[PDB]
Amino acid sequence: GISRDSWHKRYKTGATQPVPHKKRKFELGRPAANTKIGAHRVRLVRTRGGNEKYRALRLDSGNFSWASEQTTRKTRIVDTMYNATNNELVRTKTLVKGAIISVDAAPFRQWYEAHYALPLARKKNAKLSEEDNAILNKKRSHHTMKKYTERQKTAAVDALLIEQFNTGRLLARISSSPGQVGQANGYILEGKELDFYLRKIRAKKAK
């Protein structure tokens, strides 16, 4: 079937190569997973040596990571924004490593407010809902408040990240290979990487 053999190619000099043998099992390939956004669906693949791989055909929830804050939350993949390889993957909503996607911001906002006890760019005219109040205006002893006061010292969040949080969708990049590990774990863009990908997206939208 699909093969990964080096023969069947030309040589450095452009010569045709001799075929050494019939196709061997240990040099086989398999069809690509081509993971898409949708209800969870992961099939099991038996690999060489009895090991196993997890071919993710459909995925919706991704276990993403915020690096600057050093945390990891499970959010949901909303849409695909940019792909360096090809635009067809973006347009068909394909989840491949290194793909830029839009994820839910609410889990990260909840973690931030439960960890620093400060708002994350909350709306300038809207009162916090009851679930927010349960973690924001909660009241506990000064012994505990000491911990939160210490952590409030280092709490500035970049303006470019705040703008994304306002829209409620965060630009993330997939750092795993869904076709091999069966998951779409990634990390939230920030800094020069975020600026780079934002500029790419805006330029392509302008065109």
Binding site: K9, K12, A67, S68, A84, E190, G191, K192, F196, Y197
Partner: protein, 143 residues
């Protein structure tokens, strides 16, 4: 300048986004150098540099192991790749004499070596397959 591709390239083992550094305002991006070894010194262009190349022996992830060879740069027309010509003499017993032989060894030339020209003597270290034909990395330019 360093970012001239369709994707953002960064050294994988460097956290460009660290809260302490960002709050301090430090624009000094840490750089990872792996110190190839075998008595090979990281070029200053590799240590203090902004280029990203995953195949550089120092700024990349290509361990050097196997054979250390020497040759003369033949052509530098590929992207970060050069062709090294190795000249030797082959002995034919029957005639008790030698004959000139040669072999071309394509090797990856890290952007650290910016002054590379056809004619310069180079040392190359064996690495894992980097491409169809490249399996060596330039380590030293003796010029």
């Amino acid at each position: 300048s360093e970012q001239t591709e369709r994707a953002f390239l960064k050294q994988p083992t460097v956290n460009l986004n660290n809260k302490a550094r960002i709050l301090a305002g430090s624009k000094k991006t840490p750089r990872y150098i792996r110190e190839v070894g075998l008595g090979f010194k990281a070029p200053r262009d590799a240590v203090e540099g902004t280029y990203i190349d995953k195949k550089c022996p120092w700024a990349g992830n290509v361990p050097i192991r196997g054979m250390i060879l020497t040759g003369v740069v033949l052509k530098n027309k590929m992207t970060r790749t050069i062709v090294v010509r190795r000249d030797y003499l082959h002995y034919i017993k029957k005639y008790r004499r030698y004959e000139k032989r040669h072999k071309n060894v394509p090797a990856h030339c890290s952007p650290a070596f910016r002054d590379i020209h056809p004619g310069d003597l180079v040392t190359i270290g064996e690495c894992r397959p980097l491409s169809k034909t490249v399996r060596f990395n330039v380590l030293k330019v003796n010029k």
